[PDB]
């Protein structure tokens, strides 16, 4: 019966919470008490990339750690040469309401998406010298929130239709559809081994998916508002989330629960972006109060601030070698910090 | 700088030129967001995205409707929002009032003005002369309301219609007047389905929106 199975859901809910409390012997704050703090992290704006005439929603770094792509509501993807500030490409978009962008690991493709519900793949290095739409991936019934390449032929897309999809770009069809979120999926992050990825939705839950099998291994629930940003730890055994409750949280994949909470009474605004450092000792988070905060991932202590933007910090990324961090804002500027 | 980094710098400067030239066109177009529940006659005003272009008095206008708790942040720098209400289906005016209240008090729409069209004022007239359906069932405060003496702008229409017509408008203005701080304004209008002045009305209201933005640039308002 519909009521009979309803109790079976709550019976297992306390059975899961029983296993989580059995495995919570100590806390990460207890173990990392006798470790040296990082001190004060003083980063300076090394570059200011200008040219976007509207607010910036997304940026992504290339794997060479020199090229990055940026998306703006003006309707254009710009590819910057961060070292020399030069623009490599300016890609006009069919729809101006872009919400995300991605950079293929090979460097051959960039992706894009927004309110048109279409993930558009662009061919960066072809003959004819220009940039062309390689493929348009239709099939989502809600807006596209985030997208990441697994390879040159496989991309993963999240959407406001409460689903995530895995696409074969050659054919143009969803290979796998991931279901289980009850709200608008807002972000995803790919594991270093690319066999798993985490999702974050507006139901205040994070879900760990299996790219191959196609199912949901784990569900993490500690937040109390929309989860806007998600990111793996470099180790691949943990990930960090940022929500509208002015709170970051660290979840352990193997312990199946939250380890640490990054909160401060002075912050009351939401978190738009999150990223880690190369070692995993720095948690960087962009906020709605115009600035970015660097956290010690192991001690829940602020280590610095990146206050150099005149509007909301929308996107944020760290280079693959850890040499720099880039921030984008609604003030239409990108800044490289080192 | 090497030989082909000067050429890279020169190519970058040509990209800046096209970006600047394309943003000049974007500055001469006014952008609108179209909003309103289904059955409101939303797609018959100017008689995931469905863009629509129209111009009036040599000014470009560019209107969007999305077919909202999250994506509404993208439309944070729009010139106005056009909210459309079926002012004749009394069963759902409460939904229209809570839908309008969420938009008005939204955190990212604090400086965006709303142009309020009340479609189906020809169907509101039939529902009030016939007398079969009354406001007072759905809104108790109707029996104690009276058309203001100063406000007598009803040309050639029945007195019973003008009271219900003005009561429905107040239910939306009082939401706007409550918490707006004067940083954004609600412009109300009445339209039936076939009013051909709807472009002029958005224009006159958008000209008032640009005037207030210009006054605040110079610390006059």
């Amino acid at each position: 019966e519909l009521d009979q199975l309803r109790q079976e859901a709550e019976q297992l809910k306390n059975q899961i919470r029983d296993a989580r409390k059995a495995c919570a012997d100590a806390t990460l704050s207890q173990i990392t008490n006798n470790i040296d703090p990082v001190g004060r992290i003083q980063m300076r704006t090394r570059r200011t990339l200008r040219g976007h005439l509207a607010k910036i929603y997304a940026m992504h770094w290339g794997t060479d750690s020199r090229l990055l792509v940026s998306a703006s509501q003006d309707g254009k993807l710009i590819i910057w040469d961060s070292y020399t500030t030069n623009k490599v490409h300016a890609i006009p978009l069919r729809s101006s309401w872009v919400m995300t962008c991605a950079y293929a690991p090979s460097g051959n493709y960039v992706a894009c998406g927004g309110l048109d519900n279409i993930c558009s793949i662009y061919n960066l290095k072809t003959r004819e010298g220009n940039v062309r739409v390689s493929r348009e991936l239709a099939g989502h019934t809600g807006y596209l929130s985030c997208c990441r390449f697994l390879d040159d032929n496989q991309i993963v897309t999240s959407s406001g239709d409460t689903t995530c999809a895995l696409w074969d770009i050659e054919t143009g069809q969803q290979t796998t559809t991931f279901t289980g979120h009850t709200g608008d999926v807002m972000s995803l992050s790919l594991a270093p081994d690319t066999r798993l990825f985490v999702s974050g939705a507006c139901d205040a839950s994070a879900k760990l998916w299996d790219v191959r099998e196609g199912m949901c291994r784990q569900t993490f629930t500690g937040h109390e508002s929309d989860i806007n940003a998600i990111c793996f730890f470099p180790n691949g055994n943990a990930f960090a989330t940022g929500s509208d409750d002015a709170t970051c949280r660290l979840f352990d994949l193997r312990a199946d629960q939250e380890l640490m909470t990054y909160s401060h009474d002075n912050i009351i605004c939401g978190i738009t972006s999150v990223s880690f450092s190369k070692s995993g000792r720095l948690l960087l988070a962009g906020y709605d109060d115009f600035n970015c905060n660097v956290w010690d991932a192991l001690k829940a202590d602020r280590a610095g601030v990146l206050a150099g933007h005149d509007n909301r910090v929308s996107c944020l990324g760290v280079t693959d070698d850890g040499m720099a961090v880039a921030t984008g804002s609604w003030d239409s500027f990108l800044k490289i910090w080192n | 700088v090497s030989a082909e980094d000067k050429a890279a710098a020169e190519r970058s400067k040509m990209i800046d030129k096209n970006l600047r030239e394309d943003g000049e066109k974007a500055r001469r177009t006014l952008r609108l967001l179209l909003l309103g529940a289904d059955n409101s006659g939303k797609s018959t005003i100017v008689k995931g995205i469905f863009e629509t272009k129209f111009q009036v008095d040599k000014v470009n206008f560019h209107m969007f409707d999305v077919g909202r708790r999250k994506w509404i942040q993208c439309f944070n720098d729009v010139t106005a929002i056009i909210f459309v209400v079926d002012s004749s289906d009394y069963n759902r005016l409460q939904e229209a009032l809570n839908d309008f209240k969420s938009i008005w008090n939204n955190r990212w729409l604090r400086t965006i003005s709303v142009i309020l069209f009340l479609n189906k004022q020809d169907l509101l007239a039939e529902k009030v002369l016939a007398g079969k359906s009354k406001i007072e069932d759905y809104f108790p405060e109707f029996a104690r309301y009276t058309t203001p003496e100063d406000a007598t702008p009803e040309p050639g229409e029945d007195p019973r219609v003008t009271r219900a017509k003005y009561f429905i408008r107040k239910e939306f203005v009082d939401i706007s007047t409550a918490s707006g701080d004067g940083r954004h304004i609600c412009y109300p209008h009445f339209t039936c389905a076939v009013d051909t002045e709807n472009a002029r009305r958005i224009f006159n209201d958008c000209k008032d929106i640009i005037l207030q933005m210009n006054l605040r640039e110079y610390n006059l308002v």
Partner: single-chain antibody, 231 residues
């Protein structure tokens, strides 16, 4: 991608001519264009260059003052104006497209040339002038330069070209290490400043001709003498 060129013919000394090249099949307005000639039996020499947007024009000192380069971007055509023609102005004239951004490969496409028959600098040398190589054998082609092509940005600005008999030259290596698009992986390049090598492992037919090494560090652009491979 095509670059067909027209003009040519016999011109008396002191005469004048106009050489035109038309592009078809690529975004012509975003490519810089070069004129490179080779004398009837001699090597490759660089003439002129016009940037995208026509903002930068360079000439070789031999033709400076009496040669004008121009382009008509809407009509997809490149020009060269001959004035005060000389007996040293007889050559196969080639048109070359170049695009310069981070990671680009300039001098990708050369065009079939036209023949005109008119009746300091980085000197860089290919000491070997002729090499007979048996098929299937590794062969190394080397050239050196007067100064270092290694720049402060870590880019070494040396390029390798191949000219098969009766053919326009094509690019093999750009910036001394990178293979061009559509080139077998058996081609490799290496070397430090002022000492460079091109290795052809598992040599085959249709892999013979004259090999040139161009420097792109500074203008004027300099080519090598040409180390040729014969069966």
């Amino acid at each position: 991608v095509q670059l067909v060129e027209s003009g040519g013919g016999l011109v008396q000394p002191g005469g004048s001519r106009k050489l035109s090249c038309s592009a078809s099949g690529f975004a012509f307005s975003s490519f810089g264009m070069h004129w490179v000639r080779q004398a009837p039996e001699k090597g490759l020499e660089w003439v002129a260059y016009i940037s995208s947007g026509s903002g930068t024009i360079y000439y070789a000192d031999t033709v400076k003052g009496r040669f004008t380069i121009s382009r008509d971007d809407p009509k997809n055509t490149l020009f060269l104006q001959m004035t005060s023609l000389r007996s040293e102005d007889t050559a196969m004239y080639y048109c070359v497209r170049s695009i310069y951004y981070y990671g680009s490969s300039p001098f990708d496409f050369w065009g079939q040339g036209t023949t005109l028959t008119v009746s300091s600098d980085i000197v860089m040398t290919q000491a070997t002038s002729s090499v007979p190589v048996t098929p299937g054998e590794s062969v190394s082609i080397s050239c050196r330069s007067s100064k270092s092509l290694l720049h402060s940005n870590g880019n070494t600005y040396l390029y390798w070209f191949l000219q098969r008999p009766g053919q326009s030259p094509q690019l093999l290596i750009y910036r001394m290490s990178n293979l061009a698009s559509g080139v077998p992986d058996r081609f490799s390049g290496s070397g430090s400043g002022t000492a460079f090598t091109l290795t052809i492992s598992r040599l085959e037919a249709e892999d013979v001709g004259v090999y040139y090494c161009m420097q792109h560090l500074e203008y004027p652009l300099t080519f090598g003498a040409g180390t040729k491979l014969e069966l």
